[PDB]
Amino acid sequence: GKKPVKVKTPAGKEAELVPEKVWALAPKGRKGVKIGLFKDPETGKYFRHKLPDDYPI
Amino acid sequence: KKPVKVKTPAGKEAELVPEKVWALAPKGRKGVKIGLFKDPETGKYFRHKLPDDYPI
DNA sequence: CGTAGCTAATTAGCTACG
DNA sequence: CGTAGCTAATTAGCTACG
Numbered sequence: 001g002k003k004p005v006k007v008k009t010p011a012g013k014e015a016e017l018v019p020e021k022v023w024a025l026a027p028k029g030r031k032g033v034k035i036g037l038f039k040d041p042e043t044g045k046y047f048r049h050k051l052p053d054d055y056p057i
Numbered sequence: 058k059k060p061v062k063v064k065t066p067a068g069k070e071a072e073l074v075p076e077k078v079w080a081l082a083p084k085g086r087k088g089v090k091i092g093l094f095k096d097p098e099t100g101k102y103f104r105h106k107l108p109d110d111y112p113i
Numbered sequence: 114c115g116t117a118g119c120t121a122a123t124t125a126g127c128t129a130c131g
Numbered sequence: 132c133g134t135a136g137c138t139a140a141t142t143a144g145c146t147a148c149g
Contacts, residue, residue, distance in 0.1 A: 025120095089115095
């Protein structure tokens with residue numbers, strides 16, 4: 001079970017979505033941010049967003 | 058559009074035209090003029106100092 | 114201090130083409 | 132039709148000098 005993330009949707013509302021896919025966006029040598037792929041349940045569209053630094057990848 | 062004599066990160070010397078130029082200066086100081094270059098050898102970008110007379 | 118935008122990975126959502 | 136190729140969008144640290 002992948003943990004849900006609290007995100008402000010592109011629509012505007014807040015929601016506890018669970019990422020379709022998770023990966024680390026980082027230039028070599030150092031860690032960067034964690035990016036999750038989300039699907040807006042409302043409009044059906046996709047959007048990316050930063051994840052908490054301690055989110056399990 | 059004027060070429061600038063820069064030392065590439067690759068190590069070689071080249072006469073390159075900067076894609077983007079601007080002034081990197083704090084308040085009250087002159088600072089420097091910075092150019093955005095692209096190493097033709099590797100395709101890698103790098104910043105470098107431009108002459109103080111360069112058109113910004 | 115000060116500006117500017119590349120860099121990394123990922124894929125949906127296009128367009129393009131054979 | 133099927134497939135291949137390009138971009139938008141997502142972060143923050145990095146680097147250039149004086």
